[PDB]
Design an enzyme around this catalytic site. Structure first.
Site, PDB file in Angstrom:
ATOM      1  N   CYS B 109      -9.234  51.504 -38.628  1.00  0.00           N
ATOM      2  CA  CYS B 109      -9.692  51.549 -37.240  1.00  0.00           C
ATOM      3  C   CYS B 109      -9.843  50.141 -36.684  1.00  0.00           C
ATOM      4  CB  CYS B 109     -11.022  52.296 -37.106  1.00  0.00           C
ATOM      5  SG  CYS B 109     -11.514  52.342 -35.361  1.00  0.00           S
ATOM      6  N   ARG B 112     -13.555  49.101 -34.519  1.00  0.00           N
ATOM      7  CA  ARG B 112     -14.864  49.112 -35.147  1.00  0.00           C
ATOM      8  C   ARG B 112     -15.857  48.111 -34.566  1.00  0.00           C
ATOM      9  NH1 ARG B 112     -13.348  48.389 -41.133  1.00  0.00           N
ATOM     10  NH2 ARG B 112     -11.314  47.733 -40.312  1.00  0.00           N
ATOM     11  N   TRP B 281     -12.115  55.909 -27.330  1.00  0.00           N
ATOM     12  CA  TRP B 281     -11.186  55.833 -26.220  1.00  0.00           C
ATOM     13  C   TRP B 281      -9.872  55.338 -26.776  1.00  0.00           C
ATOM     14  CZ3 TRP B 281     -15.980  53.397 -25.993  1.00  0.00           C
ATOM     15  CH2 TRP B 281     -16.013  52.062 -26.413  1.00  0.00           C
ATOM     16  N   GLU B 286      -1.226  53.706 -28.503  1.00  0.00           N
ATOM     17  CA  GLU B 286      -1.226  55.031 -29.109  1.00  0.00           C
ATOM     18  C   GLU B 286      -0.456  56.004 -28.231  1.00  0.00           C
ATOM     19  OE1 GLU B 286      -5.000  56.269 -31.109  1.00  0.00           O
ATOM     20  OE2 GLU B 286      -5.953  54.780 -29.799  1.00  0.00           O
TER      21      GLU B 286
HETATM   22  C1  HEM Z   1     -14.240  53.333 -29.505  1.00  0.00           C
HETATM   23  C2  HEM Z   1     -12.927  53.142 -29.389  1.00  0.00           C
HETATM   24  C3  HEM Z   1     -11.950  53.274 -30.578  1.00  0.00           C
HETATM   25  C4  HEM Z   1     -10.742  52.706 -30.616  1.00  0.00           C
HETATM   26  C5  HEM Z   1     -10.112  51.802 -29.536  1.00  0.00           C
HETATM   27  C6  HEM Z   1     -10.119  53.046 -31.877  1.00  0.00           C
HETATM   28  C7  HEM Z   1      -8.871  52.644 -32.292  1.00  0.00           C
HETATM   29  C8  HEM Z   1      -8.181  53.186 -33.350  1.00  0.00           C
HETATM   30  C9  HEM Z   1      -6.749  53.243 -33.527  1.00  0.00           C
HETATM   31  C10 HEM Z   1      -5.693  52.677 -32.545  1.00  0.00           C
HETATM   32  C11 HEM Z   1      -6.506  53.844 -34.699  1.00  0.00           C
HETATM   33  C12 HEM Z   1      -5.120  54.147 -35.308  1.00  0.00           C
HETATM   34  C13 HEM Z   1      -4.977  55.641 -35.011  1.00  0.00           C
HETATM   35  C14 HEM Z   1      -3.540  56.029 -35.124  1.00  0.00           C
HETATM   36  O1  HEM Z   1      -2.687  55.105 -35.052  1.00  0.00           O
HETATM   37  O2  HEM Z   1      -3.256  57.249 -35.265  1.00  0.00           O
HETATM   38  C15 HEM Z   1      -7.776  54.211 -35.294  1.00  0.00           C
HETATM   39  C16 HEM Z   1      -7.987  54.838 -36.494  1.00  0.00           C
HETATM   40  C17 HEM Z   1      -9.179  55.379 -36.957  1.00  0.00           C
HETATM   41  N1  HEM Z   1     -10.388  55.403 -36.280  1.00  0.00           N
HETATM   42 FE1  HEM Z   1     -10.757  54.343 -34.581  1.00  0.00          FE
HETATM   43  N2  HEM Z   1     -10.987  53.851 -32.579  1.00  0.00           N
HETATM   44  C18 HEM Z   1     -12.132  54.020 -31.815  1.00  0.00           C
HETATM   45  C19 HEM Z   1     -13.225  54.777 -32.167  1.00  0.00           C
HETATM   46  C20 HEM Z   1     -13.446  55.397 -33.374  1.00  0.00           C
HETATM   47  C21 HEM Z   1     -14.613  56.200 -33.737  1.00  0.00           C
HETATM   48  C22 HEM Z   1     -15.772  56.471 -32.752  1.00  0.00           C
HETATM   49  C23 HEM Z   1     -14.446  56.606 -35.014  1.00  0.00           C
HETATM   50  C24 HEM Z   1     -15.340  57.457 -35.937  1.00  0.00           C
HETATM   51  C25 HEM Z   1     -16.604  57.745 -35.611  1.00  0.00           C
HETATM   52  C26 HEM Z   1     -13.170  56.090 -35.477  1.00  0.00           C
HETATM   53  C27 HEM Z   1     -12.630  56.258 -36.739  1.00  0.00           C
HETATM   54  C28 HEM Z   1     -11.318  56.025 -37.080  1.00  0.00           C
HETATM   55  C29 HEM Z   1     -10.659  56.419 -38.316  1.00  0.00           C
HETATM   56  C30 HEM Z   1     -11.304  57.143 -39.529  1.00  0.00           C
HETATM   57  C31 HEM Z   1      -9.387  56.016 -38.246  1.00  0.00           C
HETATM   58  C32 HEM Z   1      -8.340  56.221 -39.355  1.00  0.00           C
HETATM   59  C33 HEM Z   1      -7.515  57.450 -38.995  1.00  0.00           C
HETATM   60  C34 HEM Z   1      -6.444  57.717 -40.033  1.00  0.00           C
HETATM   61  O3  HEM Z   1      -6.499  57.162 -41.168  1.00  0.00           O
HETATM   62  O4  HEM Z   1      -5.529  58.524 -39.717  1.00  0.00           O
HETATM   63  N3  HEM Z   1     -12.615  55.359 -34.454  1.00  0.00           N
HETATM   64  N4  HEM Z   1      -8.757  53.780 -34.444  1.00  0.00           N
HETATM   65  N1  LIG Z   2      -8.239  56.053 -30.327  1.00  0.00           N
HETATM   66  C1  LIG Z   2      -8.198  56.959 -31.211  1.00  0.00           C
HETATM   67  N2  LIG Z   2      -7.095  57.163 -31.936  1.00  0.00           N
HETATM   68  C2  LIG Z   2      -7.114  57.695 -33.188  1.00  0.00           C
HETATM   69  C3  LIG Z   2      -8.112  57.373 -34.111  1.00  0.00           C
HETATM   70  C4  LIG Z   2      -8.108  57.931 -35.383  1.00  0.00           C
HETATM   71  C5  LIG Z   2      -7.080  58.783 -35.764  1.00  0.00           C
HETATM   72  C6  LIG Z   2      -6.078  59.102 -34.856  1.00  0.00           C
HETATM   73  C7  LIG Z   2      -4.978  60.045 -35.273  1.00  0.00           C
HETATM   74  N3  LIG Z   2      -4.477  59.668 -36.607  1.00  0.00           N
HETATM   75  C8  LIG Z   2      -3.351  60.556 -36.931  1.00  0.00           C
HETATM   76  C9  LIG Z   2      -2.178  59.772 -37.514  1.00  0.00           C
HETATM   77  C10 LIG Z   2      -1.209  60.789 -38.067  1.00  0.00           C
HETATM   78  C11 LIG Z   2      -1.661  61.658 -39.054  1.00  0.00           C
HETATM   79  C12 LIG Z   2      -0.795  62.607 -39.588  1.00  0.00           C
HETATM   80  C13 LIG Z   2       0.516  62.675 -39.128  1.00  0.00           C
HETATM   81  C14 LIG Z   2       1.447  63.686 -39.688  1.00  0.00           C
HETATM   82  C15 LIG Z   2       0.961  64.647 -40.561  1.00  0.00           C
HETATM   83  C16 LIG Z   2       1.815  65.603 -41.091  1.00  0.00           C
HETATM   84  C17 LIG Z   2       3.160  65.592 -40.738  1.00  0.00           C
HETATM   85  C18 LIG Z   2       3.647  64.628 -39.859  1.00  0.00           C
HETATM   86  C19 LIG Z   2       2.790  63.672 -39.330  1.00  0.00           C
HETATM   87  C20 LIG Z   2       0.964  61.807 -38.143  1.00  0.00           C
HETATM   88  C21 LIG Z   2       0.102  60.859 -37.613  1.00  0.00           C
HETATM   89  C22 LIG Z   2       0.611  59.924 -36.534  1.00  0.00           C
HETATM   90  N4  LIG Z   2       2.071  59.736 -36.653  1.00  0.00           N
HETATM   91  C23 LIG Z   2      -6.096  58.565 -33.570  1.00  0.00           C
HETATM   92  C24 LIG Z   2      -9.397  57.811 -31.460  1.00  0.00           C
HETATM   93  C25 LIG Z   2      -9.638  59.166 -31.632  1.00  0.00           C
HETATM   94  C26 LIG Z   2     -10.988  59.435 -31.895  1.00  0.00           C
HETATM   95  C27 LIG Z   2     -11.839  58.333 -31.963  1.00  0.00           C
HETATM   96  S1  LIG Z   2     -10.851  56.941 -31.679  1.00  0.00           S
END
Ligand code: HEM
Ligand SMILES: N=C(Nc1cccc(CNCCc2ccc(-c3ccccc3)cc2CN)c1)c1cccs1
Ligand code: HEM
Ligand SMILES: N=C(Nc1cccc(CNCCc2ccc(-c3ccccc3)cc2CN)c1)c1cccs1
Ligand SMILES: C[C@H](O)[C@H](O)[C@H]1CNc2nc(N)[nH]c(=O)c2N1
Ligand SMILES: C[C@H](O)[C@H](O)[C@H]1CNc2nc(N)[nH]c(=O)c2N1
Ligand SMILES: [Zn+2]
Lengths: 410, 410
Positions: B109, B112, B281, B286
């Site tokens: 993330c 953070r 947000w 993304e």
């Molecule tokens: C507040 C604004 C936030 C921004 C701008 C942000 C930004 C991002 C981005 C760009 C990613 C990559 C997601 C992707 O490419 O699919 C990410 C991943 C992640 N975020 Fe944040 N995030 C925010 C808030 C949060 C919050 C509130 C939480 C949890 C309480 C969180 C937990 C995570 C986690 C666990 C991942 C890893 C997801 C994964 O491994 O698929 N984020 N974040």
């Molecule tokens: N700002 C944000 N964004 C964000 C943050 C954390 C996680 C994600 C979404 N993380 C999904 C990445 C993912 C996972 C699985 C698969 C996948 C699974 C099975 C088959 C094919 C694809 C593909 C992708 C993206 N390609 C978005 C926020 C959302 C909520 C708080 S912050």
């Protein structure tokens, strides 16, 4: 023990067993991944024959003569030669095989689809810096090939006791100088300011401008290094124009056509070649993104965005991204319009995926460093971004080595 | 045992000792780095108290009462509660601490810097899917905040025996449907085509268009999941226009303002919350890069480059890169002009570096996944590209979990 790598854009899965032949260590552990650390970290006879045997086994395997008589006799010949001198000498065939496979094994190189089209210049008979200069000039001339660039490596004598190393002190055969100004700013390439001064210290007379090609600083048999100026006719340069924006000429940018790394160490069969300049051709982004737009390099995004009349007040106008793309179209157009080999990051990364599929098929894997393989712009619209890659260390290999001035008993 | 990470754009070095508190494993070994693998890989009472003790030690440390009487009594209270029920219950304070720190520990993330501004909605009293719906609606409403988005997490009852899990079957609270066409093409979002069908199987009546917000599929106490439609007034959407190109409206693109992941597992003190939708947000890329331009997502680069009248014959014209930048200026402009919170990749990545410096200073480190932190475009013109990062697993944490339909005794 039979690891899977997936591409999340094609759903293609490849199985890696080649990582089992991995020898060196990655820097990672079970509890910490160091995959974004840029640099992760004399020989004896008791360690040498294992390394020689491993390499000779893979060499003789590769020519359909693994375990044959010629293999065993060579194994015994090398064992006995290590007995006598506590080192040994590679056959010309082994040297070419090893160099090609050091490139084949370079996990950070997106260009490896070409790994077997490598021209190996054996410079192991070199004894003096002047010989090095000559050998390096012929490398530049051959590799450049009037713009039809050809991949080449020139291999100087292997390390012996350690205090008789051959070294090219330049980080690349061809690089632009860098000088700090009276007002603290930097003219030319900030990356080379220390090296540019080292040449001035050893006697370089600098034409304190931007794109001044540095001289060579060549160390032979551990002696003090010596300055040589590559004939300018051998240094192909590309003036950077844009196919649309005519002011792009006024930018007055130019780059050299031949990327030729000269500060790395080639390891073959436990033998260490500390001077092994190798060259290919450029991927566009190396110049247009990193060289021109790194804040610690030429740092031109400012100027380009100005001439484009972009909204530079807000970071969120993406004026930087917009100027970055224009610059890389200009580098590509300029090289192609001059028939000087270059590859765009889309072509290069597509070829690497194809290369990966070949290696998993005919070799059981392909060591690959995602952090380095993904281009520095347009990451996810290239196919490597979506490609899981296993990184591991196979030998023969190219290794980093300390800068010669930090270590050399002077 | 005191590892160094360097930034190669600022020459700044930070020292990491926090990785010593790392518990889980990375997937990497001494011989293979798995840092680009996308996914790397019931409880008992004998394992639970260690996990509870570790967490309670860090909780009580964080409130300047490590080793105090209140700490020991809580430790004994939890030990005795694990004795009785082979599980335990967190205090509201502990739940909020744990959730914030699961976010703080999310190495992927980039957002953070905000980790302590997290609104924790305790939904552990929920018993039914309808309760879940209600709780989720209030989350969406609160988090969206008329466009002044607020970070929030809603935490449903922890896993008990395993066959009574609370699950949100959506991968995000708000996502657009995806249907395959008669001619094999895909309308809407190809990523959700399986989930979109699962809703049709459980009874969804689909308005087979592009940007149809999926219903919720909510599983409560391990029962079969149930469909609910979020009130449309709660789903803030942004029409995508460009500040220069007026045809960009004709593109007819829109995205939802609230990114809210709902398929992850929150681990606190060895307790497992299988339903913990959290929202922040968007970072612009993304939407503009991944959602709109992934070949397996909306895949719009074709259309945008057409309307820009770009040279699409050659890969090397960088028409893809040029259209990609225009799209991301449009996403940003559209969100900002609507006062809907969004952050550009330059602002976000700069803040992450600042966040990193804070964490190394006041915590001895910051787990960070370069592969995920570097934005999917303009990599090296953002400061994280140049920032070495150590990845390691700290707890509390967010974990991936199997999709509910692959595991649920139905
Ligand atoms: C507040 C604004 C936030 C921004 C701008 C942000 C930004 C991002 C981005 C760009 C990613 C990559 C997601 C992707 O490419 O699919 C990410 C991943 C992640 N975020 Fe944040 N995030 C925010 C808030 C949060 C919050 C509130 C939480 C949890 C309480 C969180 C937990 C995570 C986690 C666990 C991942 C890893 C997801 C994964 O491994 O698929 N984020 N974040
Ligand atoms: N700002 C944000 N964004 C964000 C943050 C954390 C996680 C994600 C979404 N993380 C999904 C990445 C993912 C996972 C699985 C698969 C996948 C699974 C099975 C088959 C094919 C694809 C593909 C992708 C993206 N390609 C978005 C926020 C959302 C909520 C708080 S912050
Ligand atoms: C033929 C065209 C080639 C292309 C397009 C290419 C492309 C690249 C690129 C873009 C990089 C990243 C360099 C950087 O970002 O600084 C790289 C790294 C590397 N290349 Fe290639 N390369 C080519 C030929 C070669 C050859 C001929 C060799 C050796 C014989 C080689 C060995 C390596 C090595 C060892 C690295 C890693 C450098 C490091 O770790 O700093 N490459 N390549
Ligand atoms: N096409 C090419 N390209 C290419 C390939 C391999 C290696 C390189 C150059 N690799 C250098 C990366 C590097 C290393 C050290 C430092 C550094 C060291 C000390 C202090 C500060 C920086 C900075 C950088 C780049 N930022 C270019 C080719 C050249 C030759 C054949 S193919
Ligand atoms: C910190 C990080 O490892 C460093 O910036 C790397 C990232 N990836 C790279 N990739 C390439 N090809 N070349 C580089 O110099 C770098 N730099
Ligand atoms: C194969 C690779 O790990 C995969 O494409 C990753 C790369 N980095 C990423 N980074 C982010 N933020 N989100 C992603 O989905 C991915 N995908
Ligand atoms: Zn690793």
């Amino acid at each position: 023990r039979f690891l899977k790598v997936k591409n999340w854009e094609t759903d293609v899965v490849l199985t890696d067993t080649l990582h089992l032949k991995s020898t060196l260590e990655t820097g990672c552990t079970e509890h910490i991944c160091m995959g974004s650390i840029m640099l992760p970290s004399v020989a004896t006879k008791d360690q040498l024959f294992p390394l020689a045997k491993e390499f000779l086994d893979q060499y003789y395997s590769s020519i359909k003569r693994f375990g044959s008589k010629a293999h065993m006799d060579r194994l015994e010949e090398v064992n006995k030669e290590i007995e006598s001198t506590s080192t040994y000498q590679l056959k010309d065939t082994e040297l070419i095989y090893g160099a090609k496979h050091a490139w084949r094994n370079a996990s950070r190189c997106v260009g490896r689809i070409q790994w077997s089209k490598l021209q190996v210049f054996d410079a192991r008979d070199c004894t003096t810096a002047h010989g090095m200069f000559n050998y390096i000039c012929n490398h530049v001339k051959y590799a450049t090939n009037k713009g039809n660039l050809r991949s080449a490596i020139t291999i100087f004598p292997q390390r012996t006791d350690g205090k008789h190393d051959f070294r090219v002190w330049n980080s690349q055969l061809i690089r632009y100088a860098g000088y700090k100004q009276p007002d603290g700013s930097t003219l030319g390439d900030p990356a080379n300011v220390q090296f540019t001064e080292i040449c001035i210290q050893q006697g370089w007379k600098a034409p304190r401008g931007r794109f001044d090609v540095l001289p060579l600083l060549l160390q032979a048999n551990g002696n003090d290094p010596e300055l040589f100026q590559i004939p300018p006719e051998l240094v192909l340069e590309v003036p950077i124009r844009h196919p649309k924006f005519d002011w792009f000429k006024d930018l007055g940018l130019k780059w050299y056509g031949l990327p030729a790394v000269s500060n790395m160490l080639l390891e073959i069969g436990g033998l260490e070649f500390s001077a092994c300049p190798f060259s290919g051709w450029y991927m566009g982004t190396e110049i247009g993104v990193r060289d021109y737009c790194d804040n610690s390099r030429y740092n031109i995004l400012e100027e380009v965005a100005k001439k484009m009349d972009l909204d530079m007040r807000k970071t969120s106008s993406l004026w930087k991204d917009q100027a970055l793309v224009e610059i890389n179209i200009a580098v590509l157009y300029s090289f192609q319009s001059d028939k000087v080999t270059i590859v765009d990051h889309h072509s290069a990364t597509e070829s690497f995926i194809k290369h990966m599929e070949n290696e998993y098929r005919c070799r059981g894997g392909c060591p690959a460093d995602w952090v380095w393989i993904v281009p520095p712009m347009s990451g996810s619209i290239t196919p490597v971004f979506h490609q899981e890659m296993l990184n591991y260390r196979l030998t023969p290999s190219f290794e980093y080595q300390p800068d010669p001035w930090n270590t050399h008993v002077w």
